[PDB]
Design a protein around this ligand. Structure first.
Ligand SMILES: [Cl-]
Length: 431
């Protein structure tokens, strides 16, 4: 509901999976919808952007059954040519990824589609995909190179070899999809190799791929898929179990990034008790994460990790609040407004929960202490709202978190997952 109310936890326990992120979730259902056969998708993020993708595919005749509370989809593929013109404009909500992937998928279809979304989405730039898509023969009308986009399906799409002056996995993913419906082969080359989840998903669905090249005329084969859990969503539970006495949990199949330091490792530096096991590379790289309660010490976050901490794992600041000593985030230069606002909200909430915290022009400083019960404002930022729900696990009293509407729309299963592991949170009427 509008506000979240928590009460202190007796200690977390149990095993859960957290959903994957938006990007992999979109790609999985999209590829499954045009495959032949039935695909069961586990770990599908059930937020508004991902369900907007689902409803769009259904408008075009896809068979997708949604089990929201279990993060499951069961897709009966309609084949490469089973999509049909939607009767109305496809509303992509706030999803830039949805509109861009759908533009690639629909450019080579033998029908027309209008793609739009909310006012935020109607300002998102689209030239980067429109031009390359036009080279393959796409007919995409738009004003100001932003949505709405009217795609006049071109069944005569032809493959292209594309040489980019800068890396971009968003363009690549779009062209790979358009390539599935284009004559000959479509190839994408970059100065440096960019992120490649689309490529692995294509292989998972048994499409042939040969820089990165794909050919039209091939066929997608249904194949069950378990989306790796988003480390950002998992971080909430990792911190919860780390700071709450008597806690022991296991997070199954969480996507792990081996090339970066990360939240698990920053937590380990604070003295956390985390075991990463059962590492596999057949999904993105995946692992089970076992977390037990552990006393923590404040650390100096290296500059390179400051933006990432604030952007992706602000719940790490909740762990700093209960550690012994101070934790310091100082970036080389003053932070961007998005970062500055985020830290100001975290600092203000922490202060309201009796923690000594100061915002800096290039970061923040947290004096480790004791979280008290009280009231904070999430400022409709789901990451902030969730971080304070986690602070509630150890707070001396109940914590009320105002304006949590965006948690339901970004990560709706948070509340049920929190409760299932012993972390008390319930939606209540606000203001
Ligand atoms: Cl969810």
């Amino acid at each position: 509901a509008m506000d979240y109310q928590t009460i202190p936890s007796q200690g977390l326990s149990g095993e859960i999976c957290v959903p994957g992120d938006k990007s992999i979730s979109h790609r999985a259902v999209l590829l499954a919808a045009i495959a032949e056969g039935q695909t069961q998708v586990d770990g599908f993020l059930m937020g508004a952007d991902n369900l907007a993708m689902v409803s769009a595919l259904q408008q075009m005749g896809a068979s997708i059954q949604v089990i929201e509370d279990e993060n499951i989809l069961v897709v009966e593929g309609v084949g490469m040519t089973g999509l049909q013109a939607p009767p109305e404009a496809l509303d992509c909500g706030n999803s830039g990824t949805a509109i861009r992937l759908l533009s690639g998928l629909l450019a080579g279809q033998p029908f027309n589609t209008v793609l739009t979304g909310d006012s935020s989405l109607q300002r998102r730039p689209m030239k980067r995909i429109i031009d390359p898509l036009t080279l393959m023969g796409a007919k995409i009308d738009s004003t100001g190179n932003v949505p709405p986009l009217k795609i006049y399906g071109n069944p005569r799409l032809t493959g292209i070899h594309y040489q980019l002056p800068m890396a971009s996995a968003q363009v690549k993913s779009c062209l790979l999809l358009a390539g599935l419906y284009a004559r000959g082969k479509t190839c994408i080359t970059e100065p440096a190799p960019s992120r490649d989840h689309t490529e692995r998903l294509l292989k998972h669905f048994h499409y042939t791929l040969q820089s990165i090249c794909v050919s039209g005329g091939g066929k997608l084969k249904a194949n069950d898929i378990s989306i790796p859990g988003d480390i950002s969503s998992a971080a909430f539970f990792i911190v919860a179990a780390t700071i709450t006495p008597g806690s022991a949990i296991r997070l199954c199949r969480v996507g792990v990034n081996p090339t970066r330091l990360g939240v698990i490792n920053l937590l380990k530096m604070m003295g956390a008790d985390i075991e990463v096991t059962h590492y596999t590379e057949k999904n993105e790289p995946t692992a089970d994460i076992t977390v037990r309660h552990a006393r923590l010490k404040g650390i100096d976050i290296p500059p390179d990790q400051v933006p990432l901490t604030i952007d992706e794992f602000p719940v790490l600041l909740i762990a700093a609040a209960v550690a012994q000593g101070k934790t310091v985030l100082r970036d080389a230069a003053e932070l961007r407004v998005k970062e500055t606002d985020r830290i100001a909200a975290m600092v203000d909430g922490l202060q309201k929960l009796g923690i000594a915290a100061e915002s800096l022009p290039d970061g923040v400083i947290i004096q480790g202490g004791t979280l008290e019960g009280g009231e904070v404002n999430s400022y409709d930022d789901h990451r902030i709202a969730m971080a304070f729900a986690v602070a509630g696990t150890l707070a001396k009293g109940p914590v009320r978190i105002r304006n949590c509407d965006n948690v339901k729309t970004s990560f709706p299963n948070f509340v049920e997952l929190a409760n299932e592991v012993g972390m008390n949170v319930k939606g209540v009427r606000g203001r």
